[PDB]
Write a protein that holds these residues in place. Sequence first.
Motif, short mmCIF file in Angstrom:
data_model
loop_
_atom_site.label_atom_id
_atom_site.label_comp_id
_atom_site.label_asym_id
_atom_site.label_seq_id
_atom_site.Cartn_x
_atom_site.Cartn_y
_atom_site.Cartn_z
N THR A 80 -6.74 2.71 -2.04
CA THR A 80 -6.45 1.91 -3.22
C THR A 80 -5.12 1.20 -3.02
O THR A 80 -4.06 1.85 -3.06
N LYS A 81 -5.17 -0.11 -2.81
CA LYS A 81 -3.97 -0.90 -2.50
C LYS A 81 -3.15 -1.08 -3.77
O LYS A 81 -3.46 -1.89 -4.64
N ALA A 140 0.84 -1.19 0.00
CA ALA A 140 0.00 0.00 0.00
C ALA A 140 0.87 1.25 0.00
O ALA A 140 0.54 2.25 0.63
N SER A 160 -0.55 3.90 -1.96
CA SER A 160 -1.80 4.17 -1.28
C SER A 160 -1.63 5.28 -0.25
O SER A 160 -0.64 5.33 0.48
#
Lengths: 560, 341, 476, 62, 135, 54
Positions: B252-253, B243, B246
């Motif tokens: 949003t990984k 991540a 992220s």
Amino acid sequence: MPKRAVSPAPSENEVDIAGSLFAGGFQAMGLDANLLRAIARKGFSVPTPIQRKTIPLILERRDVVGMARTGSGKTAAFVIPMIERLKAHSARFGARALVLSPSRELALQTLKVVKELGKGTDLKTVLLVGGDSLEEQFGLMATNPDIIIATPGRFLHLKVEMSLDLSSIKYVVFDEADRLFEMGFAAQLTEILHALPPSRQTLLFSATLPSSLVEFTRAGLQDPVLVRLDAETKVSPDLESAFFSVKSGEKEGALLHILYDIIKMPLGDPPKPTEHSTIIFTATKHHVEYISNLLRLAGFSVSYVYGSLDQTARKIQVDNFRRGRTNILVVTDVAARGIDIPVLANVINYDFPPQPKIFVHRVGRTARAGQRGWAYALVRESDLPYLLDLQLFLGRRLVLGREEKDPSFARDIVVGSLKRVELENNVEWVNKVLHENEDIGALKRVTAKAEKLYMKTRNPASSQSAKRAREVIVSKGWGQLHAIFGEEAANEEQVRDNLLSKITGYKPQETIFEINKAAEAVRSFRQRIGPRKKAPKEADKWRDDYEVRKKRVAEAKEKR
Amino acid sequence: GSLAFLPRKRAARHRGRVKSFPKDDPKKPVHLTAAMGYKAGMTTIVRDLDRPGAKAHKKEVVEAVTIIDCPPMVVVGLVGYIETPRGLRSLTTVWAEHLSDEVKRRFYKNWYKSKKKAFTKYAKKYAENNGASITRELERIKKYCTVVRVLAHTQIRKTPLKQKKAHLMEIQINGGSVADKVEFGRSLFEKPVTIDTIFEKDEMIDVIAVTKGHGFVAGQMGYHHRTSVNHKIYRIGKGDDEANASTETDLTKKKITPMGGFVRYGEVNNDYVMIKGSVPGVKKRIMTLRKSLFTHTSRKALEKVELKWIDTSSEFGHGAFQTAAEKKQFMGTLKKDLQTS
Amino acid sequence: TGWKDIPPVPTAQEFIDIVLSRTQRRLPTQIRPGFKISRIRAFYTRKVKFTQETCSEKFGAIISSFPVLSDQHPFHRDLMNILYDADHFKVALGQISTAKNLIETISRDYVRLLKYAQSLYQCKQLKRAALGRMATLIKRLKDPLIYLDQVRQHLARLPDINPTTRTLLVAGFPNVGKSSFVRSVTRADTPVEPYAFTTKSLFVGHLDYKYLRYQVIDTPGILDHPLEEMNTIEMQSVTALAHLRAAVLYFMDISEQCGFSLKAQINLFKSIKPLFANKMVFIVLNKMDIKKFEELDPEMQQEINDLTKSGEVEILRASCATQEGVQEVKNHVCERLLVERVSQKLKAGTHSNGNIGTRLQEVMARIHVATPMDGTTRETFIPEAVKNLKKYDKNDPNRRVLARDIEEANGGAGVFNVDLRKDWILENPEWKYDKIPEIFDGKNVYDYIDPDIDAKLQALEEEEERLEKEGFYDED
Amino acid sequence: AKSARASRIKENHQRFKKNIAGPVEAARLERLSAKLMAIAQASGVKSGKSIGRKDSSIVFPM
Amino acid sequence: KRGAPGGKLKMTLGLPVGAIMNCADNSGARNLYIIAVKGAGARLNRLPAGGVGDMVMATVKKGKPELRKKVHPAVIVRQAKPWKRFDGVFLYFEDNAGVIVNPKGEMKGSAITGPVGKEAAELWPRIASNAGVVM
Amino acid sequence: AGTINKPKKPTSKRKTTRLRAKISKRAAEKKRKERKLARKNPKDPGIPNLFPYK
RNA sequence: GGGAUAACUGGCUUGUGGCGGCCAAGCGUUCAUAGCGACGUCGCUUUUUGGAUGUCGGCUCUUCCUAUCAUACCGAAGCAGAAUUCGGUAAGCGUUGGAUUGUUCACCCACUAAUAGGGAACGUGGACCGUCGUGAGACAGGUUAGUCCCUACUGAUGAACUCGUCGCAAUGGUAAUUCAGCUUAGUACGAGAGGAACCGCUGAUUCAGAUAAUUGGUUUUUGCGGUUGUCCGACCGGGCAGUGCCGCGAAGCUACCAUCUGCUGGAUAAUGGCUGAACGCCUCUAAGUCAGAAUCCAUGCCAG
RNA sequence: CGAGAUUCCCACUGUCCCUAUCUACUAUCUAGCGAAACCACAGCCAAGGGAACGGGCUUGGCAAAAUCAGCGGGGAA
Ligand SMILES: Nc1nc2c(ncn2[C@@H]2O[C@H](COP(=O)(O)OP(=O)(O)OP(=O)(O)O)[C@@H](O)[C@H]2O)c(=O)[nH]1
């Protein structure tokens, strides 16, 4: 950047009547029948004095220099004898008549006059002005016209390009030669003069006669006869004159006072000139814009026409003035000689003219055909010597203040001061506008700089004029009220100002510093002053009008 | 051009020399001064500006940021310098046993045809109870030296490059007495050091590299040793998190690497440093991060950064799909994928 | 606007020193005998021309910058004349022109001489001689520079009034209390020292009267001389009284403490009466507290009422020491002045014709008040809170916090960071200082926010269960 | 505009260094050194405690 | 104060000296002739260029006869040259447009035709006041 | 002045033989001119007071 | 026609006129009177009302000087404020146009912090032989005179010092400039009009070193799509148009057409002081000493 | 498809630049062959070197082999 980028566009209108050192119907003048019929169709029933005096000389084949204002019929005056001399198209190759005019608009006007007055004749007339196709002009020269109307620069360019022979030219006309010289066409004018054969008849029609123009006429004309518009310099006896000594800081307010009370002009749009017909003549175009904006703010119907104004704009303004949609016309000198000015009832000169003869022209602009006219002058302390030169030129007795109880304002040059109360109120309102609206302040600054430049560039006065200007300033009449303000006024201001005159005539005993080295210097200085005793783009399939555009492309390809 | 950078000279060494370290005072706690990475590439971020008095205050601001892949570095040596009327000079250096194959490749030039003999007798000296000599060298460093530097190497075998030779550099230890920093280095021997350990969040540093040589169309134009000052690390990513790209704003990984991998570099799986602005050097090149010599004089430093997201569209084209998931979802099913399935 | 933007002028030795300093420093200075004679003459004529140019520009700045006496308002011209003798000022500013013009004449003369110069020593002595001529000219100009510097200094330190604007002059004998009245009525510092001629110059203050500016002028004072002989201070006083179109107040006191008999003030005022006949004048009996209007003798009362008989004069009482009636008198006199100004403004535009001026049309347009024909008034929303909160006062100690004070405590303009989270209002307080998700899986969380999304998701799940029963995903 | 090496600007920069960036960089380096320490702990002649010899353009040849 | 805007971020200036742009307000002018950009630096051989929100000297070459061939200050409102905005957004306009303005900021006209740039609107408040479309 | 930090052009004390010769000739001319003027043409202080035995 | 000089200046050049008188220390033919004789003052130029320029240039670049236009610093001025003027320390920094003209400056106007002056061997790119005339001249008559080498410097390499890694730094260069906005503040000041500065913050111009995340531009990637005419009788595939043209286009390269970055200590000059002699007062100076300019010297930077 | 409604441009020049097209001119390396002009002997810089005479000489700054590519310093009227 474009503030006085090159120069003040209206420079000056210099005139030299020393050029005088050069020396009743159409049926009675006996023109051809066809020319007479053309003139009758045009509507010229009674010839004006300019052509009445010039056409017989031109028919006698004498070189002519004509002093005439715009609109008197100069174009007709030099075209009617030209047509009467030509009488037909010549089968021999070579132009016979040439006319040189400053601008394309004047060239077009001359062309229209030529066509209308030569309706019926087989004469071929051509126009050669800037912006037209050189190939088209080549084709016209190949068609071999008999009459040419052109500007000097374009005519010279065509002559150089085609190696044209001017030996066949016998008739030469210079329309608006003073304008030609003001625009600077002198070099190519002299080149055309050298190229033209000596055996030619030269006519030069102008409103003014500058010294350079006089020299050019002396060098290029063979015994020129000077015809002038009758009594253009004789001041009409029906002209009433009043001159006001005004300070620069109160001078706009004085103009407003004259407009408000002396003329009693109505305010607003008026409901062929009008009953008032107030025209104002100034020095600079910046002054024109400033005064125009100030007067429209004040509520007048003002049209302004200045030297370097756009052609369409000046036509619209002159049309408005002549049709009476505006009552005031603001002009310096150049637009004045340029435009057609009808009969006026009120003429005011804001900036006093340097030349008495310019003043004479500006005051002869009114009081015509026996009608009475009024003329008001704004004169400053610096403008007084020019007023004195004017009084010498006119031969009129000077009445300062109220030296005479009933001076004749038509035969005597009467100078006085304006009423203090209304003067101060108009000054206050002018100051308020200047402080409030910034546009007018910027106009004030630019017109002040323009006035400073005009002071440097103005022709100087005479030593004696400066002298008796000093004695007039010393005299009491400089500060006294004008004779137009009333004997009762004379009574009140005479009761009062005498002690005020004593106040103004105070000689202080000692300066306030006398009341150190500076003080000692002042005392020694005092002892020293001690008084002395195109095809469309290729169609795209994705485009909506794909087939239609393809059809257009195919049609264009077929057209080639 | 500027007279301080002419005549235009080639960089004698491809690595880049640090020249100057921050001045030392004993009062601070111990710390290394430098670190190394490899310029992977750049992405785009948008940020909630926290600059009071700025026109764009508390507004979305779009910036370009360099990614430096930073694998953990290994401590393999200590050096002791002595101060002399002719400058600083290397007094004595101590190495570590079990030196890596890659640092040995640095010690060698033709590795494939050479029998691996380097530092073998040195390892033997460690092994055969010459700890007398070892402690002698360490005591010499503690007694006579005023400046100590840790020899640290970065590891191509973790970086995603065709290279196989490691990268060595000396890194000064400041903030403490000489004995304290020598003991700290002795502890440091044979242990990886992370960029979380060397540097930290949202901070201003200096970056050394060699700016690209613009060759083959009055002389050398390009390939110049440049240390660009005052560049702000905004982010440190971890590799193993997955991540990394992220951000708190979008859950949003994804990793910092956009769709298709970095152009001409690859895909990074390690600790990385994301720094503001354009930075000298090119891809695959060694990048030398170091601390500023002077304490900062602007709110740009000690301005805390809050991120929104990082551009992960493929830089190999004008793509607009951040993740393969959203791409395969938006495009729907294709005939080739249907035939495969 | 004033005359302070007048550049300083130097003394003779100064102006010489600076002019020669420019011509020494601002141009090349080295020339050699081996150089060409043409270049030598060019060098020396360039020196001469530069000296001419600097002298001419300085003198031109000086003349064109000093005021042009007989283009200003009669107040200004006569005031500067009494302060500074106009004829003598003009002969000075004359000498300076003639001197500059002679400088340019010498400039052309030595330009021709240098153009026909034949040797380096020739150019030497020619340049030396020319610069000597300018030096001697300034040396004779030594005294006008001092005089013009002094007049520049005062004209800079000269009060700037507006003769056109609404003005109120205060006049009378000295020591009556004019300065006390002007200090009471406006914020202007006038020496109130109790000796005969305390104020030797006109003093100026300003006031507001229903949102309108008025300018008050204090004049020094006038004695019994019949205006044929005067001190310059009394002459500037009478010039102000005669040329300032304004309301006139004549301050006289029943007590002869001022040092002049009531008959003396009466004679002075009847003497100056024609100067005030056009105007509105207001005799103010000052120091009524020490000597009221009743106790003086009946024939004195009778003569002051005979003075009152005329229709452009008014009588008022005042006591500037305790300010018994200064507010009332200023209010009343300025009110009558305002009414007269309104009358004049109406007449200007009401002039005989039948067509009103554009400015007058605009002023009616402004003064016109619009009102609905229905005559109904809309109901208004004013809350009781702002009805009964307290007025905002800066000196008040027990004050509100203010964002300005929070800023100043926590830094300044560029230091303090404002936090909108404290201003956020939410149901659950710890909701604040929480990040708000914006984008998720490449689709906008905000764009997909919707209430009752739980029920909508239930409906979607029922639909998907129906599809699963339909076998909407089986392969055949 | 005042030069970058002006005395006034230098004094203001020194004041900023000592009053603003000082504590921030101090706390930063404190946590950094803490993590450094976390990672780090994560006969005289015969023993080598006495420093001996290992293994001349200053003096003239003798 | 000299007529140079204060507080303006960098942008791709796309209007050089001597540019024929179209007019925006109802003053009557049909186009303005960029002749001098106020605030530009002094570099040799470099043509001064202006962007949205900068007052530029303008001359009416085509317009109503009353206002024709008149030089007054004017500020750029629309530029077709692409420029980026701090939100990272590259944008450009259809044309090149400016409104006639006095040096203090009073616009001679009364209504502004077409859209107005945010830069001009923010730098000059009354442009925002008399602008009916700003994007 | 900042002569201490930024020295100026040095004034050479190495005299040239041409300059030396010119000075010699002109000084000789000066001596001859003095002699010419002298040929063209157109009070004891006393014992000092501080002397002990005046 | 003869004679003479082969030619000029080279501690030369700059800011303060000349003539006459008065005064004048001294010196002098023997003494201030054979007489020479500075600074000043008086008389003339010089007073009572406010265009000159002939051949030239034009551009760029390097370097240097300051006799400094601006930036920095202070001393003085009726310098209230603001805007200024004069003076000096200062060469680090930068130092734009239009009109007009044969052409330059002056003056004039537009920007702009400002449009300062110069040096660099004045830095780099015809005259007789005559012939025809002597109150003045001419000659299509002639004789005719008339120039590719060395090396410093930089970059890139480079022999030996066993090869390689990591370092030191003598030395040389050295880089930042200006303007603007917010706050201070409509405050200090001011009758009004107007109207600052310090601290702190944020931008912009120029210059310098970088970089291609994103946006335009460029297509021997000859990538994808379209398309023109030709011939090989036709398909076919080709030559075809020294790479056919038209759309979109990656990568790369780029852009004052995009983004980033540009840094700190000491000693000083004008000047302001402390202590205190010369000189029983006094004094910034003599001993000792403090502060102080964009100045200098070094760090930061580049080469090694 | 709507007479569909509305917006922008077109000029000349004995003026400058660029891009488009035509003609002409242009090409490298290794092998083999292979001259000529010119040549008293060689070329660091600064100041001095009476005679505008310096490459000799005096005093200094200094001074390290050898190649390729740019570059600037010297040679009377
Ligand atoms: N008791 C009393 N004394 C007054 C009053 N007004 C003025 N004064 C006196 O006036 C003296 C000062 O003179 P001003 O007030 O300046 O009078 P002025 O008419 O302006 O005359 P100048 O003094 O020359 O300026 C004071 O010492 C008072 O004693 C008043 O109303 N009451």
